[PDB]
Ligand binder design. Structure first.
Ligand code: ADP
Ligand code: ADP
Ligand code: MG
Ligand code: MG
Lengths: 614, 614
DNA sequence: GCATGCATGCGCATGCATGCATGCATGCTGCATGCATGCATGCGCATGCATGC
DNA sequence: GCATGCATGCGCATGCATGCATGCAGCATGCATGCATGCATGCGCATGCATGC
């Protein structure tokens, strides 16, 4: 029967939902969607814990401290408003600043039980999504009547109830036999996941701590193993810890699950674009020095190397791939290789690409070997089946892979990369498993000269020492050297000393600067690094240029000319060069946001290739 | 959760209540009463089982056969209509013809369990009305909050439920002590009664059969021990008949309780007066021979005895009694005595008064003795207290007592009747009991002459032989004799032979006429016996005449004249004669329906007294 | 007016429906034993590759 | 070209999380007796009345 306290807690949350009206229209929107569009959306909204502090302090403190008394009231209050604006229950989500309830699996203790918490870590394993039976319907052929029953369990209501163990009906109240109507019963899905502390926040050489999260219905398939995640929910004690006859059974009943992005991880980074942002992105295009402004802002601290600055942007945007009715796939990724002297900032260039790209994985020479790049087979304890867990290149699909110290790899891995750089498929034929996986990735790499330093007397085949088959699979092979000089020594020295003296905004000189780990959230003046990602993200999703009848003649001339010319080149010439020219041409048209490839872009591609060749 | 069958059964009873709209306005009336009048009325109505047969046959058959499935639906349907017309639950009652479900406690067997039945019999014992606790409210001084709980049992719902044995709360959910708020809790009353087969329908010399009826709330104090009753309800089996370890526990859960009237019983007879009836009753008055027409219709089959015919009507209407501020009570009942020869139809006159009067008890000489007339003391097994059960004259309050063979009584009962005929109180002083009871009754009696036949040679003191104290307590002493003759022999013979040849309407001559037991229900041409009761009932309730300054002189003259006159009279003269004249005068004014006594009535009273005296 | 037998209350004795604790034994049930089963582990050996000479 | 040493997969024993039945015992519930209690029975005895003579 009605409780006064429940009623007042509902009333105050009705007033809260009335004062800040940004949540009512959000509820309106989902009904508008599910009616006008008949992908049915789930019945949920998100609340800010910062708004609650301003509106009411005690109600805020109560959800932080006593969720099991203030959450069902708020949910019922929300359901009432939903049924009000209406011409299936509803549930809430939580965001804002939590404070002392922003914990990790190691610092989460028994004094935080029965409160709402935020937990950080890595997802290590997910289970199979299973149906759960709620209501079952039956039929009696001797009376022409249908009967039903309801089932419930302890992980669906935040407060403790008196158990009702009902049974599965096979028989009528007179004895008539009942047929089970599987299509008329209701089933709701279930999944369980385990979380662990992230490897770069955990103490070195110490065993890790983990926590179990239970998800149901709509939150059931949001993540995969090996992800950075933030979860919010109630830390619940269950059952009796052996007092009917280790301790109590503890787990989190999830309500919010946020994917997070980190360096060298399989979760991509995306940002929400404001119309103001779009206006600047589109304004920048018309000025006909877009390429130079964007190129010089690519790690401006390294000096020169402007053509590699161009090439990295061309790889970051990339062309277009094409599928024919036949069933043929034609590649559209660009790959870069760099050979130079042992103090030419190769690793700074690689690390910058790792920091800026939306999805990137870092590998160093012999570091990754064999299965570590392609895939490996494991066994599942429960079902007993043999499964696959992804290697580096399977994870970096529609992305970039950074290979530092490229020349240190064995031939066995080289033959495996031959298949990824051209067909972009990985084929596995192990005991019982025969499957093909997708790996559509671009590759950037850096290599050391065989003789320590580049020898101008000898020809390239004696300095590089890589097979022609692998060389042809790289679109661009750049060579760089540091010529000892005085003019450039002065110029470089002065600039490098400029850089080494820089105050971050807001410190008195002397004060040490402070380091923090950057965890993201997923959904001629130089341009800011945070804006370059916004530019690229729009430039890939929106523009898909088509080929014109003009520039084909330029490409044809350049390819024919190169193949019937007799200068010693830094790479062999094949049909791969023919396709490379088109990929390069379409990348520049992605830079310009035009719907068609053009002649100026074709000549920029040709100029770049010829500089990198001769 | 909702049942389809329950829903359809509710819907059809909504249609039934809609087609016959005589039950909706009855519900309207009770709300009108309880709002306008703020004696709150109970929430109940009465349905006809004859209407149900015409509207739907299967629904009728279902209530007769399956009450436990069609009664809760009908009650809910009624509650919905009540809450509809509204600008606490409601319940039903049943009347009409039942058929094979009109049984007695002897013919009620185990094949009628779980069906609605009608039972006839006599109420033999009633229990004490006790409160029953439903909802209890509490207070916590450490939190300023009030808590409640609900209780239920098996005798409140017609269908079987799963028991919930809740406990009495003394403690809060934290441990705070609670005060019990007796004024805020809800209590509903309870009573149990036993029924037995009536003595004039039961087989002679055989032990009787009985049945238990449970009544609750509003039906809790409708009857008293020693009443003819008709009860309708469900015949229920309760508990487990020893199968957890005689047979099952059987009882009736009452819904309807009707009092019935029978000859020589304490339940009065009343009829509902139609406006058409009132018009005839009031029309008859204006004609100035009302007394003669009503008098000659009093058992017309007995011949002559017209002055006794008048006297019986005067007793049947009676005067008015008066209470003073002082605390004095002045009598208003009339009493009659008759002395005559052994073939003068005395007992026919007595039996006619027994059959016609609204409440009458028959006693014959030595038949009733001692406690049988006044009262007796018994003991109650449960509470152990000494109680009183009423004798004949305590039961016949505001009524008549017929004593045939008056001269056969002993002096001990005569002294007890001295107190009833004058002060109309009975005083009991037994061990522990000292109480005074009300007995306001009129008395008619008949006595035998001492010498077999009335001897004209001797004076009345030698023929009657009753004490002057008792004679003065009788208003009228009539004497009658049969004078052997020829003219009156012919006249009486012919009339008596007329009577002995009479065909009831609708029989071929020869066919025996059929006897039936007449059980009533409670709430110059000759006038019908059924109408005389209607006349008397209105004449007593409505008219209460007052005394005028005119007729007092007539009464004064007659009383003075009689007390200073020297003829041998048939009774002594006292102030009892003075009061008798006023009682007689006011009775005739009750016959005329005038608001004041008059002179013509006074002279009729004087004439009647002087005929009965001389 | 006197003598008599009946019916009315006293004054014994006994049985009888209610009601509740105690010692013995019933009847179930939670606990300790034994065991089948299938997945993972910790291991030594044979092959194919990379690094000199 | 040739000789050598390391990483990878094959082959072999062993331990160990799940899971379920059975004999034995510990353990609480229902039953049989035993009695206390207060009411009602029914049974002879004394008194006050109604009848006969
Ligand atoms: N052209 C350059 N401009 C600025 N700094 C440079 C340049 N070349 C090298 N450096 C600096 O010198 C160091 C080069 O180290 P590293 O990145 O290991 O070189 P490499 O990868 O070529 O062996 C870094 O401090 C880098 O910042
Ligand atoms: N005056 C009368 N008129 C009609 N019938 C009479 C009359 N007197 C007597 N009777 C009849 O004679 C019989 C009298 O019997 P009963 O009532 O016992 O007489 P009583 O009571 O006077 O001794 C009945 O059949 C009655 O109907
Ligand atoms: Mg380096
Ligand atoms: Mg008689």
């Amino acid at each position: 029967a009605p409780d006064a306290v429940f009623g007042d807690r509902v009333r105050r949350f009705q007033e809260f939902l009335d004062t800040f009206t940004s949540y009512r229209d959000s509820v309106r929107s989902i009904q508008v969607y599910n009616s006008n569009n008949a992908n049915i959306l789930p019945h949920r909204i998100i609340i800010s814990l910062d708004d609650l502090r301003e509106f009411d302090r005690s109600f805020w403190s109560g959800i932080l401290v006593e969720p099991a008394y203030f959450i069902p009231p708020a949910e019922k209050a929300l359901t009432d408003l939903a049924d009000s604006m209406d011409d299936h229950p509803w549930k809430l989500s939580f965001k804002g600043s939590f404070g002392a309830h922003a914990l990790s699996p190691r610092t989460l203790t028994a004094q935080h039980l029965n409160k709402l918490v935020s937990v950080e870590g890595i997802v290590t394993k997910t289970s199979l999504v299973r149906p759960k039976l709620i209501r079952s319907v039956h039929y009696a052929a001797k009376t022409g009547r249908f009967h039903y029953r309801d089932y419930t369990d302890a992980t669906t209501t935040l407060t403790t109830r008196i158990p009702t163990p009902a049974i599965y009906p096979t028989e009528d109240t007179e004895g008539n036999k009942l047929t089970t109507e599987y299509g008329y019963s209701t089933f709701i899905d279930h999944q369980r996941i385990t979380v662990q502390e992230m490897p770069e926040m955990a103490p070195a050489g110490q065993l890790p701590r983990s926590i179990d999260v239970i998800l149901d219905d709509d939150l059931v398939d949001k993540t995969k193993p090996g992800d950075r995640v933030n979860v919010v929910g109630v830390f619940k004690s269950l059952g009796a810890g052996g007092m009917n006859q280790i301790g109590f059974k503890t787990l989190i009943l999830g309500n919010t699950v946020y994917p997070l992005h980190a360096r060298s991880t399989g979760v991509a980074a995306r940002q929400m674009l404001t119309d103001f942002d779009i206006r600047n992105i589109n304004k920048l295009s018309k000025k006909k020095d877009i390429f130079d402004i964007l190129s010089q802002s690519l790690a401006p601290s390294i000096y020169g190397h402007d053509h590699i600055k161009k090439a990295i942007l061309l790889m970051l945007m990339g062309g277009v791939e094409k599928n024919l009715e036949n069933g043929s796939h034609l590649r559209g990724d660009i790959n870069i290789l760099m050979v130079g002297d042992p103090s030419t900032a190769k690793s700074q260039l690689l690390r910058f690409v790792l920091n800026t790209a939306s999805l990137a994985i870092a590998t160093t020479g012999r570091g990754s070997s064999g299965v570590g790049l392609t895939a490996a087979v494991t066994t599942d304890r429960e079902t007993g089946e043999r499964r696959l867990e992804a290697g580096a290149m399977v994870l970096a699909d529609r992305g970039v892979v950074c290979i530092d110290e490229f020349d240190k790899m064995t031939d066995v891995d080289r033959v495996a990369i031959h298949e990824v750089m051209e067909q972009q498929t990985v084929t596995i034929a192990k005991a019982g498993i025969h499957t093909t996986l997708n790996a559509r990735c671009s590759v950037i790499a850096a290599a050391n000269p065989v003789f320590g330093q580049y020898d101008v007397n000898r020809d390239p085949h004696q300095n590089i020492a890589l097979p022609d088959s692998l060389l042809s699979r790289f679109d661009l092979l750049f060579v760089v050297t540091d010529d000892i000089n005085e003019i450039r020594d002065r110029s470089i020295s002065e600039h490098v000393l400029r850089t080494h003296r820089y105050l971050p905004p807001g410190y008195l000189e002397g004060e040490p600067v402070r380091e923090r780990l950057n965890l993201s959230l997923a959904v001629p003046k130089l341009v800011t690094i945070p804006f370059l990602r916004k530019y690229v993200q729009y430039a890939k999703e929106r523009v898909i240029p088509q080929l014109t009848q003009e520039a084909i003649n330029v490409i044809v001339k350049n390819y024919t000319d190169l193949r019937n010319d007799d200068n010693t080149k830094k790479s062999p010439i094949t049909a791969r060069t023919l396709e490379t020219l088109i990929r390069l041409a379409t990348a520049h048209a992605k830079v310009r946001l035009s719907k068609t490839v053009n002649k100026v872009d074709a000549k920029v591609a040709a100029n770049l290739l010829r500089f990198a060749l001769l």
